[PDB]
């Protein structure tokens, strides 16, 4: 309703860098809010794309941001009669970024890895990797849970079980309130997908430069499966956390698997041991149900609700025609131990190929009426196809079914405005939470400041 679309603030990265591809708010140890921005095609040392991360101080006028530096050099370690190799070219550092406390985690899902041993090898594959920074102290660490030292032939002889070579760890990421980093790795176990978790504190304390293969003992990884419903499900394409079993001591995980079951799609809610508590199935094959997930209580009863995006959903129209517009599903969490039901609300796109539901951001309570609200992106939506973000307000029965406000992309065609979104943080400290919108195709980020409601609704 009350985001201000007149005086925006723009931040900008290098041309071609895809600055804005991912972003998050970051609070320093004194609570000053900044914006961390991933730019997964930023040029590295060999004038080769490797990705990069920027840490943008808040300023109404926006502008350029300093880099948050990470080591971009390929590494080699000859040890235990093997050769370990990391390959950073085109790794897409900054394809995901998240902030927790005063730490920043930025991931490179396509970082490759190989292990040589005489004439054999593991195979050079994208295991992905994450880079952790504490900007104030300069501390750095890394976490790459799918690196292995097993040779190719061993996987063949063992029928490709527990094969974490194509994980793409860091493809998605999230951090629990207690500080457990949770990485989605949709290539995990031969393209089933897996999750990897470890406390941030333990990642820092167990990491040293140059080791390349090291143990994080408190880490926990999900499981392989022989069930074909999971094959090529990309479980972990998106991830989130929240409270779904009534017990405030345990954190539950929400995992999108947009091609689960021969592309039907699914989203699963799991306990922290990866035991499945509920499964939501997509409605339509190939709609990419689970591309995005969001967790927030929208109807003010204190219980977290789940939103799921299916950006390629095809709506039925006149004369047995189908129109690809995208759809968002709202599931309200019921009182006490009970299955999430059918969806409480379906929000459906209007613009052909607009991809409504491609991203969904909790806004906290934008208009301050006591119900949390959300922003849904349609990166190619709007009447001109340039991208729109739509705001939906919470209320006692769930969400309003018509947007209270629509933000049309201020960028040119192709910017993919809305592809990343983050809300619920008050960046200018005026008592209203604000919204940041990435437009990686234009290498920019737009900040929308929430302002006092003009007339309430």
């Amino acid at each position: 309703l009350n985001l201000d679309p007149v005086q925006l603030t723009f931040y900008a990265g290098p041309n071609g860098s895809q600055f804005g591809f991912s972003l998050d708010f970051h609070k320093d140890s004194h609570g000053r809010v900044a914006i961390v921005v991933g730019a997964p095609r930023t040029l590295g040392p060999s004038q080769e794309e490797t990705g990069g991360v920027f840490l943008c101080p808040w300023r109404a006028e926006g502008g350029q941001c300093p880099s948050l530096l990470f080591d971009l050099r390929d590494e080699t370690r000859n040890v235990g009669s093997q050769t370990l190799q990391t390959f950073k070219a085109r790794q897409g550092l900054g394809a995901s970024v998240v902030s927790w406390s005063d730490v920043i985690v930025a991931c490179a899902p396509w970082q490759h890895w190989n292990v040589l041993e005489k004439t054999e090898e593991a195979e050079k594959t994208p295991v992905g990797s994450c880079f952790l920074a504490q900007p104030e102290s300069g501390r750095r660490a890394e976490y790459s849970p799918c690196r292995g030292n097993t040779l190719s032939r061993i996987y063949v002889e063992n029928d490709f079980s527990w094969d974490k070579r194509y994980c793409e760890a860091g493809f998605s990421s999230v951090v629990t309130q207690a500080g457990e980093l949770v990485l989605g790795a949709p290539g995990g176990y031969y393209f089933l997908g897996l999750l990897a978790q470890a406390p941030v504190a333990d990642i820092f304390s167990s990491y040293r430069p140059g080791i390349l293969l090291w143990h994080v003992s408190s880490q926990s990884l999900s499981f392989d499966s022989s069930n074909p419903e999971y094959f090529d499900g990309y479980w972990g394409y998106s991830v989130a956390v929240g409270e779904f079993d009534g017990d405030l001591n345990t954190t539950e995980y929400v995992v999108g698997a947009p091609t689960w079951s021969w592309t039907l799609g699914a989203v699963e809610i799991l306990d922290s041991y990866y035991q499945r508590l509920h499964r939501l199935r997509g409605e339509q094959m190939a709609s990419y149900f689970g591309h995005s997930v969001a967790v927030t209580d929208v109807n003010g009863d204190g219980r977290h609700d789940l939103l799921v995006g299916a950006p390629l959903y095809m709506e039925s129209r006149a004369d047995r025609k189908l129109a690809e517009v995208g759809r968002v599903y709202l599931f309200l969490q019921p009182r006490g131990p009970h299955a999430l039901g059918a969806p409480s609300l379906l929000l459906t796109g209007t613009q052909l190929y607009g991809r409504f539901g491609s991203a969904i951001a909790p806004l906290g309570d934008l208009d301050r009426d006591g119900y949390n609200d959300i922003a849904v992106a349609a990166p190619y939506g709007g009447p001109s196809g340039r991208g729109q973000v739509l705001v939906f307000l919470g209320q006692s029965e769930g969400l309003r079914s018509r947007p209270s406000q629509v933000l049309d992309s201020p960028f040119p065609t192709g910017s993919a405005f809305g592809f990343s979104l983050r809300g619920a943080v008050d960046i200018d400290d005026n008592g209203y939470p604000d919204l940041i919108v990435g437009a990686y195709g234009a290498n920019q980020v737009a900040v929308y400041r929430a302002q006092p409601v003009v007339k309430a609704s």
Partner: antibody, heavy 119, light 108 residues
Framework: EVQLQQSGAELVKPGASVKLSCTAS????????VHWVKQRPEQGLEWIGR????????KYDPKFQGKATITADTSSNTAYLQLSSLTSEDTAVYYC????????????WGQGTSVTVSS | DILMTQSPSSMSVSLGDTVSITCHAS??????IGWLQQKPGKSFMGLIY???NLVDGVPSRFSGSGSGADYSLTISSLDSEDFADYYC?????????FGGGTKLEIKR
């Protein structure tokens, strides 16, 4: 807290066999490589081999092939060193070892198990 | 196999001293070396991994340095509990191989 707890002193006859154990306390034996090392006063320290108890795969210094078999059982969180065709020269102290962080290192040691081979 | 020649075999030193034990390898091992301590009639504790990294719990008066084929353990300001045996181990190649050790004894 990681501890490696090895079985008691062994006293055996030339030609017999013996099977030493090393039980993980405070952690899962499956988390890392587990190595076996031999120590004698004159000859000093010698690496026997290792096992990845997750999958049973082993490596040995060739000087010990046929003498030493290293196995593991995640169920009981234990790794084993089995010595065959015992000789006086097998009289030594045996240690199980695992890395701390570095996959390839040798940081945590069991308390040691004396093996004495005599008639 | 890689030979680890450790020196000196022993040294008679005093509390407060700074001493260094060296290790020379028959070929370069790029910091894939560990240092170990064994107190009299006791088991081993790890001190250093990968050339320069303190094992958790080890006091910082211990340090490791070196590169290529030559490495050192240095103990600044010797403590009474430092009079013990020390060994290096290389893990650049299988089989892992050890130095002959060094025993710190008390000067009188």
């Amino acid at each position: 807290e990681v501890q490696l707890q090895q079985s008691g002193a062994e006293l055996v006859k030339p030609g017999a066999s013996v099977k030493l154990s090393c039980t993980a306390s405070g952690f899962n034996i499956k988390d890392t490589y587990v190595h076996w090392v031999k120590q004698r006063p004159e000859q000093g320290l010698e690496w026997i081999g290792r096992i990845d108890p997750a999958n049973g795969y082993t490596k040995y210094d060739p000087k010990f092939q046929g003498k030493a078999t290293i196995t593991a059982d995640t169920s009981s969180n234990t790794a084993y060193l089995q010595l065959s065709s015992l000789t006086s020269e097998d009289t030594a102290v045996y240690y199980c070892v695992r890395p701390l962080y570095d996959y390839y290192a040798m940081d945590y040691w069991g308390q040691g198990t004396s093996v004495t081979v005599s008639s | 196999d890689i030979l680890m020649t450790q020196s000196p075999s022993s040294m008679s030193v005093s509390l407060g001293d700074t001493v260094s034990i060296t290790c020379h390898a028959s070929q370069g091992i790029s910091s894939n070396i560990g240092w170990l301590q064994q107190k009299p009639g006791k088991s081993f504790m790890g001190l250093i991994y990968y050339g320069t990294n303190l094992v958790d719990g080890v006091p910082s008066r211990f340090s490791g340095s070196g590169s290529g084929a030559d490495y050192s353990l240095t103990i600044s300001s010797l403590d009474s509990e430092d009079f013990a045996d020390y060994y290096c181990v290389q893990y650049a190649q299988l089989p892992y191989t050890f130095g002959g050790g060094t025993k710190l004894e008390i000067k009188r």
